[PDB]
Design a protein around this nucleic acid. Structure first.
Ligand SMILES: [Mg+2]
Ligand SMILES: [Mg+2]
Ligand SMILES: [Mg+2]
Ligand SMILES: [Mg+2]
Ligand SMILES: [Mg+2]
Ligand SMILES: [Mg+2]
Ligand SMILES: [Mg+2]
Ligand SMILES: [Mg+2]
Ligand SMILES: [Mg+2]
Ligand SMILES: [Mg+2]
Ligand SMILES: [Mg+2]
Ligand SMILES: [Mg+2]
Ligand SMILES: [Mg+2]
Ligand SMILES: [Mg+2]
Ligand SMILES: [Mg+2]
Ligand SMILES: [Mg+2]
Ligand SMILES: [Mg+2]
Ligand SMILES: [Mg+2]
Ligand SMILES: [Mg+2]
Ligand SMILES: [Mg+2]
Ligand SMILES: [Mg+2]
Ligand SMILES: [Mg+2]
Ligand SMILES: [Mg+2]
Ligand SMILES: [Mg+2]
Ligand SMILES: [Mg+2]
Ligand SMILES: [Mg+2]
Ligand SMILES: [Mg+2]
Ligand SMILES: [Mg+2]
Ligand SMILES: [Mg+2]
Ligand SMILES: [Mg+2]
Ligand SMILES: [Mg+2]
Ligand SMILES: [Mg+2]
Ligand SMILES: [Mg+2]
Ligand SMILES: [Mg+2]
Ligand SMILES: [Mg+2]
Ligand SMILES: [Mg+2]
Ligand SMILES: [Mg+2]
Ligand SMILES: [Mg+2]
Ligand SMILES: [Mg+2]
Ligand SMILES: [Mg+2]
Ligand SMILES: [Mg+2]
Ligand SMILES: [Mg+2]
Ligand SMILES: [Mg+2]
Ligand SMILES: [Mg+2]
Ligand SMILES: [Mg+2]
Ligand SMILES: [Mg+2]
Ligand SMILES: [Mg+2]
Ligand SMILES: [Mg+2]
Ligand SMILES: [Mg+2]
Ligand SMILES: [Mg+2]
Ligand SMILES: [Mg+2]
Ligand SMILES: [Mg+2]
Ligand SMILES: [Mg+2]
Ligand SMILES: [Mg+2]
Ligand SMILES: [Mg+2]
Ligand SMILES: [Mg+2]
Ligand SMILES: [Mg+2]
Ligand SMILES: [Mg+2]
Ligand SMILES: [Mg+2]
Ligand SMILES: [Mg+2]
Ligand SMILES: [Mg+2]
Ligand SMILES: [Mg+2]
Ligand SMILES: [Mg+2]
Ligand SMILES: [Mg+2]
Ligand SMILES: [Mg+2]
Ligand SMILES: [Mg+2]
Ligand SMILES: [Mg+2]
Ligand SMILES: [Mg+2]
Ligand SMILES: [Mg+2]
Ligand SMILES: [Mg+2]
Ligand SMILES: [Mg+2]
Ligand SMILES: [Mg+2]
Ligand SMILES: [Mg+2]
Ligand SMILES: [Mg+2]
Ligand SMILES: [Mg+2]
Ligand SMILES: [Mg+2]
Ligand SMILES: [Mg+2]
Ligand SMILES: [Mg+2]
Ligand SMILES: [Mg+2]
Ligand SMILES: [Mg+2]
Ligand SMILES: [Mg+2]
Ligand SMILES: [Mg+2]
Ligand SMILES: [Mg+2]
Ligand SMILES: [Mg+2]
Ligand SMILES: [Mg+2]
Ligand SMILES: [Zn+2]
Lengths: 99, 99, 138, 124, 83, 208
RNA sequence: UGUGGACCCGCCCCUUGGGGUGUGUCCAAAGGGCUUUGCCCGCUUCCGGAUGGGCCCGCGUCCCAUCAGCUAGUUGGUGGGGUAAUGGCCCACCAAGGCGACGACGGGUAGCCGGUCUGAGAGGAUGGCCGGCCACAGGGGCACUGAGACACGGGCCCCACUCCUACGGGAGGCAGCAGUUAGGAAUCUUCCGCAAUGGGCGCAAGCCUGACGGAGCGACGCCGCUUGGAGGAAGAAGCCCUUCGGGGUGUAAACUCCUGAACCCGGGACGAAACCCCCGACGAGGGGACUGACGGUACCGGGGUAAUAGCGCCGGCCAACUCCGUGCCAGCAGCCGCGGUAAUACGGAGGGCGCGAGCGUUACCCGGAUUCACUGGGCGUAAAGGGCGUGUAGGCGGCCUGGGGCGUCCCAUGUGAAAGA
RNA sequence: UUUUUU
RNA sequence: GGGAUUGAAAAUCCC
């Protein structure tokens, strides 16, 4: 018995906690941004959106989201905050988005 | 090549979708007479353009739904309901031959 | 209605020769005419000619037979021993140029209908085409 | 039948039924004897034919024929079944292999020894 | 990674190899991309090695990796000679 | 292991002299002299009109026994001729004639077929310089069939070649008698064989 | 730090989410080694290539109609979630749809193919070994890590079973190679080896590899080969038959000569050349060195002994016949049939036929079988015309001309893997 | 009554 | 298990 391929499993549970953590931030930031887009705060929503995006691409850097998955979440996020900003638009910061 | 078939729309009753009946002629692999088989495709109609009895080309397409892999290329012949009448009658005989 | 006019003509001829009739009439159709042209050209009949029977057009096929023979059954040998319709309706027979048979190891013909006209098996082979196998004659 | 008919219905392959349910379609099957009997034959002949009811490893109780001049086959003896009907005895569809587990070959059998399962003797 | 190697097609005690382009992950006697040579190691015939250099050079421009022995036999047939 | 036993009995059972005994199938002892009837107790009895199968059977045996071959190699050679281009009938004969043992006999190296078989088996035969000990080896045209110089001094070889002096050889063969050489020039034709055998009957024995 | 890439939006060209562009936002990294000033193994972002793969579609793919109706995410839509990616894949809401006699639904059976077997072919049968695809890893579900798995020798949970147990709780998973047991008519060695080929890791040296290369067992198949060759009596003995004259076994044995399977002796491999070292720049090129399981086996040379034969069959089909024993007995038998006192059919013998390290038997597949008839059958009396009509679907369609070119026919081309043929 | 028309 | 009986066997008859 006792293969030391078991080492692999020990590392699995390491990376599981790495991946799982960054995603949880992503979601918790993404929602946050949208919550202010719906609530018409433009500057704060865009400020948070830039941090969301940064966290997304940073998770693409490694083995969490590596593919165009990160680009998926970005796309959906920018669409949602722009459209939610369409209610009394006033895009104050205008940082994250294009003119 | 994307496969392209020509058939007759026998169903209007969906939304953005039409059923196309496509005949097919081929010699029997053993007995050799020419036999006529036919298949129904669910084709995508985004503009609700095509109506019942129309004879339409249908093109192999990116999957739209379960059971929808074709889109309506163009209109060949407008509204010959004799085809639809053959299909409807044949459907109607099945109410007999049960009990 | 006449179901298969060609089988009908083939048969009018078959029966006609079985009683050694001089001639026999078959209802006129261009395709039939083009068949009789091959029968004539290949020496199976004396010939044919257009005619009007009671106002309607027909083809008088003049058949030929061999010599009156010796002791009992003097009846001549036949020139058309065997005529058979091959591709009938409800079971159609088309042959590619490599599917074209050799009829009676050479001594008969297979009338094809080709996109290039009604040919014999030899004509249609050397022409490099196939088509609907109409009938054996030999 | 018309071509349309053969198109619509088509021919029907003749399913062939087995003449020997020695199951698993096996070439032979071992079983234990139930009885060892002598049965009277069909009309044109008459004799005493020694047969045996066998419980088979396939789950079958069937009659088998005991070939040769004389046998040692007893009530509880085990034997192997070969297949092949005995014509002039209805019901017997399988033969018995002689020269198998509890079934002695034929003694003093000098002509057809492959059948009847007997060895090759010595000549001084 | 695509590889250039040998595939044994002789019989027992009679090996004959087929210099072959295949995915490293397939069996050695399994499905390959292209047969680009044969190798007879007992040298039973006058011609016991053939290569078709200019095809090997193709598969090397795209990064097939030859075995040590495949490279031995390729070099011998002059695949790498650049003069 | 081929047929090994009394042979001049098959001389009788076929009804034709079979020279498998070599000599003494020539001297009036062959038992085909003053005993042409088949062997056994019922040999001198009046034989019944054979069945059509019986005829093709006795013709095939008549040929098979002549070449001294098992049924196995016999039929495999036949099917080989059935596949090859040309007349099955004569192709088969050319193939049987191409057996190294048969060539050896045919070159007058051995008195008989059987003797030729033993001579091959013991490696006394050269083919293009090489020893060949298989009686079944197919000789090709242009092959030099020699005698191993090891055995050239043996008294059986000098014995047979002594009587081969001035003896004529088959038109598809030629031999040098001093150097104990020989050559297979070409395949024999039907007319090149005097075989008292109807090939068509044999072909017709294998149609069944 | 911004070569560049990603996202929103706009514009251009394309046309399904393809390419370019602008502003804005977001995103890079790692070191190690020596012959330590330069080079080798690595690292980051991007484009392309090559290879492997996902998903989608047309067509083909066994039996039962004594299975005729099936369907609730079920069919479609809008939006959303998810994924590398389309998609009722999932979710909410809306519409009421979708499938079926061209066989839906249900039941039975089953991995599919390249092929293989048979057959004149058309066809039938089959899918072992080998190659390609799939599925599964005690049964069921599940996700994690990752380019890739929902993972045989990884993880969690439920179930059944074996083992440990301080009764609280734990450990397992040969459908990997051998091997054991069970079942079964029946299926192998707990073998050698890293020398070759191939794979993983490594700058390399090298390590692992029951992949593999070999050996072992089994007439299981195929193939080659031996049990002698030549002389030898109008013909021994024994056996068998007989008209008692004789006939047969039979040139067969003896016996004469010749060769020399086994076995002994010596030599003794190919499969092996690269990796590596050195010159040359760690390139081309040149040079050089180590490297065996099989195995002292194959093979060669020398010496050399007459040195296993069996099994079926002999009434017709079917090639081979007499004697005696037995008397509807004992028994033979594929079918037709043999035996109730002369049996070429039972049993033995002599003899003969057929094959021969085999020969027979059983099972199964095709053939003969044109006996499911496309090729290639039929229905007055042989099995078969519906008791009759009307008519639905379907099948089929007179003569002339013209368009089209769907079937049909021709040319080119891509494909049709390797093996097999 | 049963087998064997010889 | 024997004789009559039948080509033989059944049946029938005799110790
Ligand atoms: Mg590790
Ligand atoms: Mg939270
Ligand atoms: Mg992942
Ligand atoms: Mg609609
Ligand atoms: Mg949709
Ligand atoms: Mg309904
Ligand atoms: Mg039925
Ligand atoms: Mg006992
Ligand atoms: Mg692979
Ligand atoms: Mg060169
Ligand atoms: Mg031939
Ligand atoms: Mg010649
Ligand atoms: Mg044949
Ligand atoms: Mg830039
Ligand atoms: Mg920019
Ligand atoms: Mg940065
Ligand atoms: Mg750092
Ligand atoms: Mg691809
Ligand atoms: Mg959607
Ligand atoms: Mg994934
Ligand atoms: Mg729902
Ligand atoms: Mg359909
Ligand atoms: Mg199954
Ligand atoms: Mg064949
Ligand atoms: Mg046939
Ligand atoms: Mg199958
Ligand atoms: Mg199949
Ligand atoms: Mg297996
Ligand atoms: Mg499972
Ligand atoms: Mg499981
Ligand atoms: Mg990985
Ligand atoms: Mg698992
Ligand atoms: Mg799996
Ligand atoms: Mg395991
Ligand atoms: Mg307890
Ligand atoms: Mg057991
Ligand atoms: Mg083995
Ligand atoms: Mg050892
Ligand atoms: Mg290795
Ligand atoms: Mg290696
Ligand atoms: Mg490396
Ligand atoms: Mg290990
Ligand atoms: Mg192996
Ligand atoms: Mg055995
Ligand atoms: Mg002798
Ligand atoms: Mg000597
Ligand atoms: Mg070597
Ligand atoms: Mg070497
Ligand atoms: Mg240097
Ligand atoms: Mg070099
Ligand atoms: Mg090495
Ligand atoms: Mg050694
Ligand atoms: Mg020697
Ligand atoms: Mg000697
Ligand atoms: Mg001897
Ligand atoms: Mg036979
Ligand atoms: Mg006979
Ligand atoms: Mg018998
Ligand atoms: Mg007597
Ligand atoms: Mg008697
Ligand atoms: Mg009698
Ligand atoms: Mg007898
Ligand atoms: Mg018999
Ligand atoms: Mg007998
Ligand atoms: Mg005997
Ligand atoms: Mg053999
Ligand atoms: Mg056998
Ligand atoms: Mg059969
Ligand atoms: Mg048939
Ligand atoms: Mg029948
Ligand atoms: Mg039948
Ligand atoms: Mg018919
Ligand atoms: Mg019939
Ligand atoms: Mg009647
Ligand atoms: Mg009737
Ligand atoms: Mg009636
Ligand atoms: Mg009736
Ligand atoms: Mg018409
Ligand atoms: Mg019509
Ligand atoms: Mg026209
Ligand atoms: Mg066209
Ligand atoms: Mg082509
Ligand atoms: Mg091929
Ligand atoms: Mg009787
Ligand atoms: Mg009397
Ligand atoms: Zn003789």
């Amino acid at each position: 018995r006792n293969l030391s391929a078991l080492k692999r499993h020990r590392q699995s549970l390491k990376r599981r906690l790495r991946n799982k953590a960054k995603k949880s931030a992503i979601k918790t930031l993404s929602k946050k941004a949208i919550q202010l887009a719906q609530e018409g705060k433009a500057e704060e929503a865009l400020k948070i959106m830039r941090k969301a995006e940064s966290l997304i691409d940073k998770a693409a850097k490694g083995s969490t989201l590596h593919k165009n998955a990160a680009a998926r979440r970005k796309s959906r996020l920018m669409r949602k905050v722009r459209q939610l900003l369409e209610a009394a638009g006033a895009p104050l910061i205008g940082g994250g988005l294009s003119a | 090549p994307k496969k392209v078939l020509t058939g007759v729309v026998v169903s209007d009753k969906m939304q953005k979708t039409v059923t196309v009946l496509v005949e097919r002629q081929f010699p029997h692999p053993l007995y050799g007479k020419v036999i006529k088989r036919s298949k129904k495709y669910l084709a995508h109609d985004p503009e609700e353009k095509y109506k019942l009895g129309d004879v339409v080309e249908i093109i192999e397409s990116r999957p739209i739904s379960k059971r929808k892999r074709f889109r309506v290329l163009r209109l060949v012949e407008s509204g010959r309901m004799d085809l639809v009448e053959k299909y409807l009658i044949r459907r109607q005989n099945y109410q007999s031959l049960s009990k | 209605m006449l179901t298969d006019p060609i089988a009908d003509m083939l048969t009018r001829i078959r029966n006609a020769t079985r009683v050694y009739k001089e001639s026999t009439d078959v209802p006129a159709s261009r395709f039939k005419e083009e068949i009789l042209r091959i029968l004539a050209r290949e020496g199976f009949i004396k010939g044919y000619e257009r005619v009007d029977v009671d106002g309607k057009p027909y083809l008088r096929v003049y058949l030929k037979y061999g010599p009156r023979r010796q002791g009992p059954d003097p009846r001549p040998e036949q020139v058309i021993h065997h005529i058979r319709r091959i591709s009938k309706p409800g079971r159609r027979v088309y042959v590619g140029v490599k599917e074209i048979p050799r009829v009676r190891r050479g001594l008969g013909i297979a009338i094809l209908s080709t996109s290039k006209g009604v040919l014999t098996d030899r004509e249609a082979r050397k022409l490099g085409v196939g088509g609907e196998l109409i009938c054996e004659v030999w | 039948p018309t071509i349309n008919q053969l198109v619509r219905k088509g021919r029907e392959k003749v399913r062939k039924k087995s003449k020997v349910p020695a199951l698993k379609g096996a070439p032979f099957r071992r079983g234990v004897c139930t009885v060892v009997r002598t049965v009277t034959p069909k009309k044109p002949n008459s004799a005493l034919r020694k047969v045996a009811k066998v419980r088979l490893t396939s789950g079958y109780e069937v009659t088998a024929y005991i070939p040769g001049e004389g046998h040692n086959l007893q009530e509880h003896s085990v034997v192997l079944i070969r297949g092949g009907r005995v014509k002039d005895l209805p019901g017997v569809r399988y033969h018995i292999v002689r020269g198998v587990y509890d079934a002695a070959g034929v003694k003093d059998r000098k002509k057809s020894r492959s059948k009847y399962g007997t060895k090759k003797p010595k000549e001084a | 990674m695509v590889k250039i190697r040998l595939a044994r097609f002789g019989s027992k005690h009679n090996p004959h190899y087929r210099i072959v382009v295949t995915d490293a992950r397939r069996k050695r006697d399994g499905k390959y991309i292209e047969k680009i040579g044969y190798y007879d190691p007992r040298k039973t015939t006058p011609d016991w090695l053939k290569v078709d250099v200019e095809r090997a050079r193709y598969w090397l421009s795209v990064g097939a990796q030859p075995t040590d022995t495949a490279r031995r036999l390729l070099r011998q047939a002059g695949v790498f000679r650049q003069e | 292991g081929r047929y090994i036993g009394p042979v001049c009995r098959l001389c009788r059972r076929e009804g034709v002299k079979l020279y498998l005994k070599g000599e003494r199938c020539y001297s009036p002892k062959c038992a085909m002299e003053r005993r042409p009837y088949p062997p056994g107790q019922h040999g001198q009895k009046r034989a019944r009109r054979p069945s059509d199968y019986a005829v093709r059977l006795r013709e095939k045996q008549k040929l098979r026994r002549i070449y001294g071959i098992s049924e196995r190699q016999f039929r495999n050679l036949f099917e080989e001729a059935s596949k090859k281009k040309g007349v099955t009938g004569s192709v088969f004969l050319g193939l049987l004639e191409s057996r190294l043992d048969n060539v050896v006999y045919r070159l007058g190296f051995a008195v008989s077929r059987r003797q030729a078989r033993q001579l091959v088996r013991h490696g006394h035969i050269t083919v293009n310089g090489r020893r060949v000990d298989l009686p079944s080896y197919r000789v090709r045209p242009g092959d030099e069939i020699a005698v191993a110089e090891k055995s050239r001094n043996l008294e059986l070889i000098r014995q047979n070649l002594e009587a081969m002096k001035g003896r004529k050889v088959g038109p598809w063969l030629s031999l040098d008698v001093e150097g104990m050489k020989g050559k297979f020039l070409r395949l024999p034709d039907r007319e090149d064989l005097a075989l008292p055998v109807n090939e068509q009957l044999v072909i017709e024995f294998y149609s069944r």
